[PDB]
Paper text:
In this work, the mononuclear binding of europium(III) and gadolinium(III) to the active site of a mutant of the model enzyme phosphotriesterase are described using X-ray crystallography at 1.78 and 1.61 Å resolution, respectively. The greater ionic radius of Eu(III) and Gd(III) compared with Zn(II) would explain the observation of only one ion being accommodated within the active site. These anomalous signals were present to over 12σ and 40σ for Eu(III) and Gd(III), respectively, supporting their placement in the structure. However, these anomalous signals were only present in chain A of the PTE-R18 dimer in both structures. Metals were modelled into this density and the occupancies were refined to 16% and 24% for Eu(III) and Gd(III), respectively. Interestingly, both Ln(III) ions are coordinated to histidine residues, which has not previously been observed in protein structures, and have a CN of six, with five coordinate bonds from the protein. To further substantiate mononuclear binding, and to provide binding-affinity data, isothermal titration calorimetry (ITC) was performed using apo PTE-R18 with EuCl3 and GdCl3. Both the Eu(III) (N ≃ 1.1) and the Gd(III) (N ≃ 1.1) titrations suggested mononuclear binding of the metal to each monomer of the apo PTE-R18 dimer. The isotherms also indicated K d values of 11 µM (95% confidence interval 7.2–17.2 µM) and 20 µM (95% confidence interval 14.2–26.8 µM) for Eu(III) and Gd(III), respectively.
Author numbering:
A (entry chain A): 35 to 259, 276 to 364
B (entry chain B): 35 to 362
Amino acid sequence: DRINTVRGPITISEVGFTLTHEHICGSSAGFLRAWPEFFGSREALVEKAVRGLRRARAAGVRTIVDVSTFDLGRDVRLLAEVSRAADVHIVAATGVWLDPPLSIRMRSVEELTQFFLREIQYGIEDTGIRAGIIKVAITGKVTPFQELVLRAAARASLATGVPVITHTAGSQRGGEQQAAIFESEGLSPSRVCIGHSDETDDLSYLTALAARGYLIGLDRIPHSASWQTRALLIKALIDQGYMKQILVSNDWLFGISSYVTNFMDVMDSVNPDGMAFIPLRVIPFLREKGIPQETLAGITVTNPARFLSPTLRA
Amino acid sequence: DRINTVRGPITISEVGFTLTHEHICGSSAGFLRAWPEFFGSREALVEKAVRGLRRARAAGVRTIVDVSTFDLGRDVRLLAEVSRAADVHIVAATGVWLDPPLSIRMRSVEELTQFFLREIQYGIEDTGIRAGIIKVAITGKVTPFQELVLRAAARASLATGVPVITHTAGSQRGGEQQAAIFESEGLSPSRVCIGHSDETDDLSYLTALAARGYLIGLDRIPHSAIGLEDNASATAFMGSRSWQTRALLIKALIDQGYMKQILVSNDWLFGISSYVTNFMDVMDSVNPDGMAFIPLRVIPFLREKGIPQETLAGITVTNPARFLSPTL
Ligand SMILES: [Cl-]
Ligand SMILES: [Cl-]
Ligand SMILES: [Eu+3]
């Protein structure tokens, strides 16, 4: 098929090495436009993001998935500018993160479905840029509104073929909650990535999800500020026979306003490699532990392309 | 000084009959741009707002204050488009309403002060349109974050001369708690309007604030869910007191000698997404006059009750101009 990016559709063969869970900027809807000086300037943030993406591209990355939603301050014009200047494909996201404003959290499941469909089928804002993934975040115990969001995401995925990525905040597991809801809606597990899965060491829980067909997002590796321990989960799942169900990423960004001021400086001090951490540190580490090149290319190239390719029949 | 509007600065003489507490659209940051079809379309929202403001203009309205903040979905390009097509002055707002996203509610008092000053002194987003008022909202008991917002508002007002308008969510009487914080920062009461003060009939509360020099926002006059008892969402939003009851608070404050402290408005809007779906239709059914309710129904009601025309012109023209004019 073809995959929608912020610069238009691309073919599966163009996707290449893909980081499945990233952001350019973690913010709030409208905030970058209303207070760019919070980031120094818009120009300073663009320059930082372009340098960071060029560095990742020189380490082999060809595509990132920016999973920022409306309520995380997704600015698709920023994504398009950085994508062109860095020559890295960026897939944009619809969905709902953990800070929905009243105009979102007052909505019914049917209205949320129509919102997701608008961003996937017509475009984001007035840009014509279409989302290629649906991002949902939940908390420990799924709230009633978070359940609406998951069901709307399943309905939008079933209508368009685009995949869903999800994570549970403040709890190790929680994938079982989401899996139950997604399956009640008829969604195929092969369209769902259970993200932040490197945050738990319960390997039997991850193996059980993989066996049901879910993709396992090991996508917070550099956030253990031990990263080697998290990366060994990749090896463990390969050894259980589930190399085809693994997605790897950094969950990095280049500006952040939704937490404490200057939290970006904290993150940059613990991981100065940025989104190059996966290609420069994790892949060599796994190679040294005996994972073949062919398996590594399956995880970083084959698996993301299969996931992102719109598939209504899976 | 002159007053900043979404079309640029105007002199005090051009302000005229003013509605001091209105909105074009009650929404969330970015939402009108991300899902305009929630309102039919952006074009339909503009047309509805232009038609409504032109009717208010025909009825004598010359200026409205749109108190929408960043987190209430303020879209200053929308305000400018509608102001120009209706030919009605619109004053835009900075501040913080009741639904701040994390990028706002994680900020310190010093950061919030800088944000307000940016919107007052430099402009909103990349438009160069400058805010002419600061809007703050609190809940019953001022939260820690809301206290930061009030102190930043006071600090920004003292730096720029721009006034502050408040309200408290519900029928709660929060003016005394807000006033205490504002005065601890050295802000003059004459730069503050205690909005939505018509939610209560506690005349002792209203008069004591007016006696300190606060402006009293009697600004939800048409809001009333009488007849809509089977609609629980309307009752919670609009209350159960008749519009005449709200309007007679105007007369009561005049009769105590505080005509110079009154500001009147409708608290209307032409689209709303921050509440239940289609709530716009409930509001429009209750008050088909929209923003023209004040000039068309309340003013002649108060004339019938014996208030002189010169006093009504003082409330609708003189008081808002004194209030909006930056002073410091
Ligand atoms: Cl996320
Ligand atoms: Cl308001
Ligand atoms: Eu993330």
